[PDB]
């Protein structure tokens, strides 16, 4: 169609199906291999993006082009990358993925929402979508493509070290959280065939259904562990939300870790390529997780030549390095040589590749667009961030006797008024894991609200604001305090250094609020990434709600603290009396909770 120099796979106007078609049959091995290879910023450069033809780059956790670089130091250093993949050859453009998982929350100042278990609390799927169209702008803001989300576990025991990234144990609250999928990527066309990918265009971007399959289900909750579970338990509990994220054109999907009955994900074609891509349909391309083909061996990395080989014939069609690509690309290319896997394995990975690339529009939009540099940490995403803490808090007690004045909502006009806690004064606290850095981290890392800013902000001029972080009992007695509030709770973790048997908070917690609420009334805000040990801390408490990990914007806890919302948010799991009863699941054998899946006490608005 026209020009002699014509070249039917750059012309914008035509089928996403015949410019796969075109460009695919142009291209060497080299060239294929190339594009199912996803490498680490931090091994990039022009030379090597070039040489190596390299289809795609990450940030892993905390992988920055610097420590607090703004929106526009992102845009240059993608942009920078793609200037490279661009001069192949082919200029086949690269796309950039990230951890954006609640917000854009590697970024300094980007917007950190609440993360998935008091997603889950708020029953709410249409705030999720909201909330994925708000995280699509602000990565878009930083010119990246391409998130890791949502995560569509289903956490069967909190012991999980990512049990605060699963929105439900019941898959029925997962499935409905499937929303995130077209807020970040844009609604399907009413036509839309399921499987297939979807990205509306360059203020959006391409999501990942991950990690498939039954990362929720390990045993003891062990993390990358063996989910021991039959056919009909993986289909009816873990299974599931796949097919609501093939039905909104979820464009990629990530292999878990994990094994079921013994059989790595990262090696299992029977459900890979048997179940994902031959019965659910799925189109899109299926990517490794980090060193994901590695750990099919024990010791991981012992036998690199057999976790490429069993990975590549299992399905995968991306793998995420991320570090030696030049031993994956060695070994791939050694294995289609010799016929070990044959071209059409190949020929397929790189189908999925660029149909994803150009349903997105990422061959006219390789470049980011400056002028979205302002979406980040933009006050309306705060706005709904706030909104989102707010619906997820679940109040789990307001007066120690059936006949006490209940304590919430308490009033913003009081003389004086103790904030307490470690947890009351500790933005990264309130975050959690996978903000700023991969385990989350202490103290004011970015932009954003603590507690006690919050508190400040909403009472009364004349009311007193005392802040003590672990006070004594004689302190809180001699204080000429109405009330406090103390936060307490959970660090910062992710994944494997999450894993926890005791599931009990750290001291001092439970003493500071013995302390508090020894001398004067006392709302007690628990900050955590699951249900802990809580009876003790209940006993001291008049009054305790749990705020899961708010994120950055504080003023959702006041919100409902001091009456401007009623409490609204229900237990997205059971809250288990001993951890000697895990696992245990609504539904179950001898099903004996502390408070049950659905639990949740209300309060109304003042005034
Ligand atoms: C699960 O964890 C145990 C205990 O650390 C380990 O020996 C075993 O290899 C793991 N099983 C997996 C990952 O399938
Ligand atoms: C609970 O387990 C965590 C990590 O698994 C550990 O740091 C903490 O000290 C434990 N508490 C106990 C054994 O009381
Ligand atoms: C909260 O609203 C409901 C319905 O209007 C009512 O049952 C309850 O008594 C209300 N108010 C308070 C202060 O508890």
């Not at 020009?3 to 049959?25: I, M, S």
């Not at 109040?395 to 008024?417: E, H, V």
Request: with cysteine; glycine share 10%; net charge neutral.
């Amino acid at each position: 169609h026209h020009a002699a120099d014509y070249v039917l796979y750059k012309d914008a106007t035509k089928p996403v199906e015949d410019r796969v078609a075109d460009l695919l049959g142009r291209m060497t091995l080299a060239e294929k291999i190339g594009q199912m290879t996803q490498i680490e910023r931090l091994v990039a450069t022009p030379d090597v993006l070039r040489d190596n033809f390299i289809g795609s780059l990450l940030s892993g956790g905390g992988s920055v082009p610097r420590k607090g670089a703004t929106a526009k130091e992102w845009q240059d250093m993608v942009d920078g990358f793609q200037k490279a993949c661009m001069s192949t050859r082919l200029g086949i453009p690269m796309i950039y993925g990230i951890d954006a998982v609640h917000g854009q929350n590697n970024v300094y100042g980007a917007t950190i929402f609440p993360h998935n278990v008091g997603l889950g609390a708020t029953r709410d799927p249409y705030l999720v979508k909201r909330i994925g169209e708000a995280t699509a702008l602000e990565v878009r803001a930083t010119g990246i493509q391409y998130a890791f989300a949502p995560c569509i576990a289903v956490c069967r025991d909190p012991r999980w070290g990512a049990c605060y990234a699963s929105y439900s144990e019941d898959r029925r609250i997962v499935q409905s959280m499937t929303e995130l999928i077209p807020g970040l990527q844009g609604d399907v066309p009413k036509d839309f065939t399921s499987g297939m990918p979807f990205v509306a265009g360059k203020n959006k971007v391409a999501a990942c259904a991950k990690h498939f399959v039954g990362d929720g289900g390990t045993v003891d909750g062990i993390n990358e562990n063996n989910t021991i579970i039959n056919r009909e338990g993986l289909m009816n509990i873990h299974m599931p939300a796949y097919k609501n994220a093939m039905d909104k054109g979820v464009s990629t999907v990530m292999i878990s870790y994990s094994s079921w009955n013994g059989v790595k994900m990262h090696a299992n074609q029977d459900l890979v390529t048997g179940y994902l891509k031959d019965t659910l349909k799925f189109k899109g391309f299926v990517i490794s997780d980090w060193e994901g083909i590695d750990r099919i061996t024990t010791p991981a990395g012992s036998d690199y030549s057999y976790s490429v080989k069993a990975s590549i014939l299992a399905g995968l069609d991306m793998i995420m390095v991320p570090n030696k690509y030049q031993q994956f690309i060695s070994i791939l290319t050694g294995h289609v040589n010799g016929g070990v896997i044959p071209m059409s394995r190949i020929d397929d990975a790189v189908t999925r590749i660029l149909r994803v690339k150009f349903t997105m529009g990422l061959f006219e939009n390789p470049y980011a667009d400056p002028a979205m540099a302002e979406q980040l940490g933009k006050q309306e995403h705060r706005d709904l961030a706030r909104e989102a803490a707010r619906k997820s808090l679940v109040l789990l007690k307001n007066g120690k006797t059936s006949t006490d004045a209940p304590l919430l909502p308490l009033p913003k006009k009081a003389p004086k008024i103790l904030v307490a806690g470690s947890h009351a004064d500790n933005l990264g606290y309130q975050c959690g894991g996978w903000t700023i850095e991969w385990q989350g981290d202490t103290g004011r890392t970015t932009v954003g609200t603590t507690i006690l800013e919050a508190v400040k902000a909403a009472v009364d001029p004349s009311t007193v604001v005392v802040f003590a972080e672990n006070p004594d009992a004689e302190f809180v007695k001699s204080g000429g305090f109405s009330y406090a509030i103390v936060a307490v709770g959970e660090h910062p973790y992710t994944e494997t250094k999450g894993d926890n048997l005791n599931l009990t908070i750290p001291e001092p917690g439970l003493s500071t609020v013995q302390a508090v609420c020894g001398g004067v009334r006392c709302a007690t805000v628990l900050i955590s990434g699951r249900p802990v040990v809580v009876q003790p801390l209940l006993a001291a408490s008049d009054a305790l709600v749990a705020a899961w990990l708010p994120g950055s914007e504080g003023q959702g806890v006041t919100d409902a603290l001091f009456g401007d919302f009623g409490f609204t948010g229900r237990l997205p799991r059971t809250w288990f009396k001993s951890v000697d009863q895990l696992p245990m699941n609504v539904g179950d054998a001898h099903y004996d909770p502390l408070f049950r899946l659905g639990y949740g006490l209300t309060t109304n608005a003042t005034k």
